[PDB]
Every structure is written in C-alpha cells, then in structure tokens.
C-alpha cells in the first residue's frame, strides 16, 4: 500500500474549529493511505513551540513570524497533499492563503467539512481552489493514492 | 507618471468592510499612479451582469460559479498589482485565497488597513503573503511605480 | 488607449490556416489596444534570418531547433497576451503546447476562430486553457486592456 | 524497487492513435518501475464516464467539460511522470496543451512513438517541451527512477 | 518609444565589478527603451536607509536580512526585465540565485559582459538561464521592447 | 523507512570544493532516509561524460551545453530534495542558479557547509533561498522525511 503525506490545514481559533481539528486528526490516523508521522502539522512546527495565545510576547517578534511562516509554506511544498479542515460559518484567512499556495505548488487540494455542516454555503474562492470536498466521516477511508476532481454537493456564496 | 492596474481585493459582507471598500476606492481615484479604469473590480465584473443578490438561485449553478471564479483569477493575473483591503477583526477566506494566487502569479501584494484598525493583530499568513501593509490614509499617495517590501508595524497571530 | 503586446499563435501549414492568419493580422492592425510592432510574430523571428523552406537541412540541426524553440517561448513570456488563431478541423499540437506555456506564464489566453467555423467542436483542453474564445470578426474591436473570462459558445470533444 | 506513477497522455481519435495507445498500455503493465494502478488514465476518469462519441449529449455541457478538464490537469499534477503517446503524422492539440501543463508543473516529459514511426518529423514545440523521446519497444524497460534528458534521433518541422 | 523597467543585477565586491557596474549604469541612462528611474537598483534600496558598511552589526540581524532579501526578490518580480552585469572571472553566487529567480518569474534574462572579457568562459548554468548575452558596448542601444533569444558567442564550463 | 532522492548541488572547481564534495557524498551513503542510487549527481550525468577540463573540445559546443544544462534542471525537478554543498569563501554561480531553480520547483533547499567553515558569512541571497543550513557532520543523520525551516547560525554579507 503506497502512502502519501499531507499538510494539516485547519484553524484552531474557535470551538467548532478545534472539534473538527480533533476529528480530522483521528480520521487520518486510521487512513491506510496516509503517512501521518511524516506529515506536517502547523501546530507542532511553530518556531520554538510558540503560539501567540500561550506566549504572547511573540505577537510582535518578526523572527518568530518569518520562520513560522516559512515553515508552513515549506510544510505544504514538501508534502504530497493539501488538506483543509473547513468550517463554512467560521472560514479562516490563513487557510485561504495556504490553499492558494498549495495550488501554486501543484498539490491536490482537499477540503473536509464536519458532517453536521456539509452542504452549507462556502466562499466561492474556496470552492474554486479546491479539487474536491468531502465530509469528515469520509476522511478515514479516502484513497489518497487516486485523488480525483469532484464538485462540492452544496452551495457557494 | 506611468500608471499601474490593480485587482480590487476587498470583502463586501459587513459594515466595516463596506466602509473600507468605499474609502479605498476614493483613495485610488486620487492616486496618480493608478489606472483605475483598466483595473479589475470584482463587484463590477459579475458574470453576464447577473446579480447574485437579486437571483440567489445561481449559488447552486456550477457554471456561474466557474465563470466568476475564473474571472476573478483572470482579473488578478492580467493586472499589475494585487490590492487587499483588510479588516483585522473581519478577515476573509476568499481574500486570503486571492492573496495566495497573487503571490503565485508574481504580483506585488499590498494590504491596506483602515487607520482606526492599523496595529491590530493579523493572521501570520496574511503578514507573510504581503509585500507591504499600509494604512488607508497612505493609499492616495502610494507610489505604485516603485513598490517596495516592508513589514506591518502591528501584531500577528 | 494604453496598448498591449501579443504573441501571434497560429498554424501556417494549410490554406484555412493561412487565410485565418492573414485575417487575424489585418484585424490586429485595426485594433487600437494592440501594439503590433512590439509584438512577437513567430514567422518574422526565424533564427538568424535563415528560412527553413529554402534550407530544410536545418530541421536536423539541434542548435537551430533550440534557438527557435527558445525564441518562441521568449516571445510568449515577454509579451502581455497570448493569441491563438485556431481552426477546429485543423488543430495544431504546437499551438496547444504554446497555449499550455502561456497559462504557465500567467498570460491571458485568447483563441480566435474564423466566423465560418465558430461553433464547431474543439478539443476539451483548448476549451479549458482558454480564458476566452471569440470570432475573427470580433478581434478588431476586442479591448485588450480589460480582457475577461468567458466560455466558447460551441462544441467540445 | 521504487515505482513512479504516470499520466497517460495519448490521443484516442484515429486508428494509429488507438493502436499506439493499446501498445503503450501493455508496455506499461510490464515495466517494473511503474505503478500503473495508481496512475491516471484520462479515458477512465472523464466526468461520469462521458465521452462525446458515446454520449454526444455532453458536447455542449459546461459542467462535464469543467470537471473533466480539471480532472486531467489534476491527473498530471499529482503523478510523477508525464507520458505522451505521439503519432508524428497525427499530432494532437490536447496532448500538446497537456505537455505544456506538465512542463509548468515540473514533470519529466517523455514522448513515446511507435517503432514504425520513430525518426519521422515532429513539431518543434513538441521536441522542445519533451525531456526525452523513445520508441514504443523501449517503454516496457524504461527506468522511470532515473529519467534523463536526451534528444530525439529524428527530425522536427 | 515604450519603456521597460529592469532589476540591476551586478556584484559590487571587486574593482572589475565596480567598473562594469558604473559602465552599465551609464549605458542604461542613454538607452531610450529603459525607464531607469522606476527600475530597481539594489544598492539604492537598502532597508530603512541603513548602510551595511557603516554598521556591520546588521549582518547578524535576521530582520535586516529578511527585509533586504525580500526587497531584492520584489525588485525582480515587479520589473519587466532582469539584467545581470557579469564578470566571467569573478562570478557571483548571489547574481546566480537572482538569475534563477528571474527565470522562475517569467522575466527576460539579459547578461552584459565587459567588451574586454566577452568570449571568456562562463558557468553552464549562467549560459542556460540567460535568454541572451551581450557586450557592455551594445547595452546603450539594446531594444528592450523586442528582446530576443540568442546564444553567448563564447566559452562555457 | 521512507527514502527521498536528492540533487547533488556542489562546485568541483577548487580543492576545498572537492574535499567537501567527497565528504558530502560519503555522508549521504550512510544516511538511511536517502536513496542515493536514484539521486541525481551532475558529474555523472553530463552529456556523453564530457567536462570541459577532461575534453575541452566541448567548450564551444552548444549541443553538449544545451543537453547538460537541461539534464541538470531535470535532475532538480524530478528529485525530492535540493542539496547545496557550499564553501562560504568559494561560492559558486552555478549552484546559485540551481538554488533559484529549486525554489521555483517547490523543493526543500538544504545547504551543507564543512564544519571548519560553518559560521562564516554567506551571500544574503544564498541565506534567503535556503530553507535550512547544516554542518557537514550533520548530513549522515539528517532526517529528510521531516525537513523543516531553520536559520543559519552564522553571518551573511
Ligand atoms: C496556517 C496554518 C493553519 O492552517 C492556518 C491558521 O489560520 O494558517
Ligand atoms: C474574492 C473577491 C474578494 O476580495 C473576496 C471575497 O471573499 O474574494
Ligand atoms: C508555435 C508557433 C505556432 O503557433 C505553432 C505551430 O505549430 O507552434
Ligand atoms: C487530454 C487527454 C489526452 O491525452 C488528450 C486528448 O486530446 O487530451
Ligand atoms: C543580489 C544583488 C546582486 O546582483 C548580487 C550580489 O551578490 O545578489
Ligand atoms: C550545476 C551543477 C553544480 O552544482 C554547479 C557547478 O557550478 O552547477
């Protein structure tokens, strides 16, 4: 069984975001086409462990910001597949940017929406950058070795 | 003065967004390095003139969505400079995506933040995609013929 | 009127191709948004003036081939807009390649089909690389300063 | 033995094209450096099985066209190697475009010509996009783990 | 005459480099196809005016380094043409990098070699990234509106 | 254990360069995350074995130069990781170009400096293209499956 690495695109700034984050991670551990251990998770790769909620002294540090930004870009460009855990009502600008970078780097762009939200309107540009969009409960079984283009079964705004 | 064209990146979904939108457009009309008439303004380039507010049934039409998405991408790639009118508390996933695409296409990426909000925290990826971020009051006199790199003087998360 | 330069993509291997070629050139001379003199016309940019029809031995010369190929690529990348004069029944692999390169370089890609052939089936990949496809009779008045996305009103296979 | 995936670039619109197609597929199944099962074959990935010869009702359907186009691009960008089954006398515009896209995505571009046609003139732009060109009878044994640049032993026009 | 902007790629670390630098700048001022005032000259775009010769402590400052590096990249991407003043015996790794970036951004890449050195051996990768290489004495009259592909008439290693 | 391929970027034109070259190769053979046998080594892939020191007749051969240049670019684009064996006092223009190409192709860019030179100033553009820089003695143990962004512990000029 060949295995692909991913970039774990996800907000971590609300309760719905954090719930979906946790669900998506568990789904990935059970997916036999994913090498999760060699994958890139932003929250585990911030420069010196820093997040502006846990060590707010880095809110204005340009060195931390430069290295973390670069590391995230690096995590996209050196992994096979771009994943975007996506809350339709709580969309994230950072993920948006990362989606656009992933497109520029030739990566398959897969959005994953919680089952309870799948169908709800998403930003047109998110719909368009994405190659496919699936429900959280499909993620454990998604075959990342044969990723195909498909349309969201749901609305845009 | 040589003149450069832009893509008018800006949300239109809140009061703050619409205020900044109107301000940014007024600033641009007074900027002598901008050819606004040959610039691309999303809201004036809705596909086949059809207004999504008057006929919301087109938010399930994949052809409308495809053409509009492509027209936005086309508006970025065929113009000199990428402008992102940016509200720190009302960050937009669609703009984020567009910023990422603008980077991929080799464009100068300029964010403009209302003076009342300049300094407030912005997403790391926004900070990073940007080549510069300025206050609304600097936009009238920004020299688009000699755009340079600088950092936001403000917070990032 | 600001003016844009183009790369003159067109086959030259049949009667229909040569007719459309001549028509497209005439249309361009009357279009006030085109700087034709600073545009790149393959047939006027043969390497070191050497004419492949008069000396066919250069079709086994790798240096001639390298320089010409590079000059065409250079002609696409250094001009504003990619033009593809396109005959639906006499589709050209070389043009196809050039279209793909033009996309890669961030150029507006415009196909122009003779009015007598507009509507006839075209290759899916041609339909897709295009940002727009118009009839020969619309080329004189096409506004290259505000190029927009639209679909071919015609068949694809 | 490491294995690479490919995008199966080939016309399917003439008898020579179909013969070469079949030959190339059989060659690939016997090549131990190719993971054919995880590879992308256009004809097996058209949106809902549709081809305009078998279900001509999709000749004018923009949804089918959008998804199929995107799927083909996706098949190139997510696989290791770009293959072009190529008939010198029956060159294909769609393949041309795909070659150009493959170049833009950093892929090794290998043309394969039937032994009976190898040596015959090919379009200059095809010669140039390609990194290498081989005969059908070399394909079963080609080492895709060590792909190198080499010149066609044959003419261009 | 339409005018094009450039990025002034040139070492500044030896006598030969500084001589060629000064010569190339003088040549450019007399070239009527160049808008030198809206061009990007590294040495006139040092971050926040701070002079690295007067305050060498900034060569350990990551913020100074980041901003300057980005400003150079920005200077390449936002200008029409990439110029590389090139001394064959004093080749520069930084220029090499910039050449590679200019290629990636779709720019015409022109090397200019002092007449006294034209013909001397240059690095293969320099020969290859270049779209053309000319002598210092040809720079005043180079037509930047119709830049074409040609080979160095000289040695490569 | 997954394994990555590399492009062996290194000068071979001085004694320090050759020493570092040899050291880096030995380090790579002992690294269990590297598939060295499927990696690309310039010196083993020059067109027909030619190097202008061993067969100087190719100093002016454009065919040899074209194919070798293309082969090197191909070696970067088809391998996972870009390596640059780097002497701070003897920087190489060819490597510089290759670094810039590697960036354009989305590759992790790792510089390796001899332990005896680690800390010494490097060109700003080299510092900036690189994602990370390590000492020769770290190379045998570097985990290429989880490559991350980090700053050189050393100066730039
Ligand atoms: C980059 C990492 C994560 O996916 C988002 C947070 O906004 O940006
Ligand atoms: C595209 C246009 C505008 O800037 C945003 C809206 O979300 O995306
Ligand atoms: C390059 C120029 C022209 O448009 C075609 C001929 O096949 O390719
Ligand atoms: C895309 C698939 C196939 O290789 C060709 C047919 O023209 O286009
Ligand atoms: C960037 C500017 C100049 O052309 C060189 C110096 O090494 O790199
Ligand atoms: C390309 C191969 C090697 O890394 C350098 C020599 O200058 O250029």
């Amino acid at each position: 069984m060949p295995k692909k690495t991913i970039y774990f695109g996800a907000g971590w700034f609300t309760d719905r975001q954090n719930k979906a984050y946790k669900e998506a991670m568990e789904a990935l551990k059970e997916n036999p086409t994913i090498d999760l251990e060699n994958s890139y998770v932003p929250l585990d790769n911030q420069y010196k462990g820093i997040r502006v909620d846990e060590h707010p002294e880095y809110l204005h540090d340009k060195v931390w910001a430069t290295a973390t930004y670069n590391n995230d870009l690096n995590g996209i460009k050196t992994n096979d597949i771009m994943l975007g855990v996506y809350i339709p009502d709580e969309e994230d600008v950072g993920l948006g940017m990362e989606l656009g970078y992933a497109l520029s780097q030739g990566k398959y762009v897969l959005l994953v929406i919680p089952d309870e939200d799948y169908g709800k309107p998403i930003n047109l540009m998110s719909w368009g950058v994405s190659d496919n969009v699936i429900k959280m409960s499909q993620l454990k079984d998604f075959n990342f070795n044969k990723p195909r283009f498909d349309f969201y079964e749901g609305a845009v705004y």
Side-chain angles (χ1 to χ4, degrees), chain A residues 1-49 51-157:
Chain A
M1 182 102 287
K3 285 173 170 269
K4 304 296 249 304
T5 60
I6 58 92
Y7 174 96
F8 194 83
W12 60 79
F13 307 114
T14 73
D15 292 336
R16 296 163 68 195
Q17 283 178 6
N18 283 316
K19 187 184 183 201
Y21 182 121
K22 282 163 214 191
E23 282 179 347
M25 198 63 75
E26 273 155 354
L28 285 174
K29 292 170 178 152
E30 310 228 84
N31 190 304
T33 63
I34 285 302
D35 173 355
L36 187 56
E37 220 223 307
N38 292 132
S39 288
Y40 182 99
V41 182
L43 238 32
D44 304 343
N45 286 100
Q46 308 286 272
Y47 190 65
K48 296 167 174 177
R51 29 186 299 179
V52 129
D53 70 315
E54 269 150 48
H55 306 277
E57 55 266 32
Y58 298 98
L59 268 161
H60 290 99
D61 178 357
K62 294 176 163 78
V63 174
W64 169 85
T66 296
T68 304
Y69 173 68
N70 274 274
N71 215 195
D72 282 23
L73 294 201
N74 183 251
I76 297 166
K77 88 200 194 195
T78 62
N79 284 301
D80 303 298
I81 282 171
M82 174 69 196
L83 191 66
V85 182
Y86 200 95
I87 293 60
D89 304 283
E90 301 180 352
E91 297 174 297
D92 188 86
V93 64
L95 184 50
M97 181 279 156
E98 289 150 4
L99 296 175
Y101 182 78
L103 173 72
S104 86
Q105 294 299 305
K107 306 300 174 174
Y108 185 71
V109 175
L110 205 222
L111 306 182
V112 191
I113 300 168
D115 296 55
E116 51 274 42
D117 301 320
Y118 191 96
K120 293 209 275 263
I122 69 183
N123 194 284
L124 176 66
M125 310 315 279
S126 289
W127 174 90
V129 257
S130 73
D131 293 307
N132 182 201
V133 13
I134 64 164
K135 44 184 49 172
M136 186 68 65
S137 72
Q138 288 173 296
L139 180 54
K140 78 200 306 293
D141 297 322
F142 190 89
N143 185 2
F144 288 99
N145 291 305
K146 318 193 73 202
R148 304 294 168 244
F149 179 88
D150 202 3
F151 290 111
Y152 185 39
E153 195 64 23
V156 307
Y157 71 85

